[PDB]
DNA sequence: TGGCCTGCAACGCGGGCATCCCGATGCCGCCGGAAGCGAGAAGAATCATAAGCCGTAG
């Protein structure tokens, strides 16, 4: 079973990765100014 | 408190007029010296191209 797929999966995965990195990795919050790594460590 | 400005009377010589000599000057012919325009060459400068570090991620 080899279903034919469109190239748009590239852009979809890129958008998903960009959203994930922007939300949960890089940008801290304004209520405490702490990264999720620092949060988990504390 | 001391010096500049000015009225006044007496001494002084320069301005005004006449004139012949002199030196600048316009003109003409002749000789020369920057010039300036374009063109070629040199230096000065701002735009365009390849990471490096910052800290997590694989």
From Swiss-Prot:
Localization recorded for this chain is: Cytoplasm
Per its UniProt entry, which superkingdom is the organism in?
Bacteria
Signal sequence, renumbered to the chain: none
**Subunit structure comment from the entry:** Heterotetramer, composed of two GyrA and two GyrB chains. In the heterotetramer, GyrA contains the active site tyrosine that forms a transient covalent intermediate with the DNA, while GyrB binds cofactors and catalyzes ATP hydrolysis. Can form a 2:2 complex with toxin CcdB in which GyrA is inactive; rejuvenation of GyrA(2)CcdB(2) is effected by CcdA.
User: What job does the chain carry out?
Assistant: A type II topoisomerase that negatively supercoils closed circular double-stranded (ds) DNA in an ATP-dependent manner to maintain chromosomes in an underwound state. This makes better substrates for topoisomerase IV (ParC and ParE) which is the main enzyme that unlinks newly replicated chromosomes in E.coli. Gyrase catalyzes the interconversion of other topological isomers of dsDNA rings, including catenanes. Relaxes negatively supercoiled DNA in an ATP-independent manner.
Which family is annotated?
A: Belongs to the type II topoisomerase GyrA/ParC subunit family.
Instruction: Please state what the annotation says regarding this protein's domains.
Output: An N-terminal fragment (residues 1-523) can be reconstituted with GyrB, but the complex no longer has negative supercoiling or ATP-independent DNA relaxation activities, although it is capable of DNA cleavage; ATP-dependent relaxation is inhibited by novobiocin and non-hydrolyzable ATP analogs. The fragment has ATP-dependent DNA relaxation and 30-fold improved decatenation activities, unlike holoenzyme it preferentially binds supercoiled DNA. The C-terminal domain (CTD, approximately residues 535-841) contains 6 tandemly repeated subdomains known as blades, each of which is composed of a 4-stranded antiparallel beta-sheet. The blades form a circular-shaped beta-pinwheel fold arranged in a spiral around a screw axis, to which DNA probably binds, inducing strong positive superhelicity (about 0.8 links/protein).
**Any extra detail in the entry?**
When the enzyme transiently cleaves DNA a phosphotyrosine bond is formed between GyrA and DNA. In the presence of quinolones this intermediate can be trapped and is used as an indicator of drug toxicity. The enzyme-DNA intermediate is also the target of a number of topoisomerase poisons, including toxin CcdB. Few gyrases are as efficient as E.coli at forming negative supercoils. Not all organisms have 2 type II topoisomerases; in organisms with a single type II topoisomerase this enzyme also has to decatenate newly replicated chromosomes.
The protein here is known as: DNA gyrase subunit A
Which species does the entry assign this protein to? Escherichia coli (strain K12)
> Per UniProt, what is the name of the gene that codes for the protein in this document?
gyrA
Part of the whole protein covered: 8 to 49 of 875
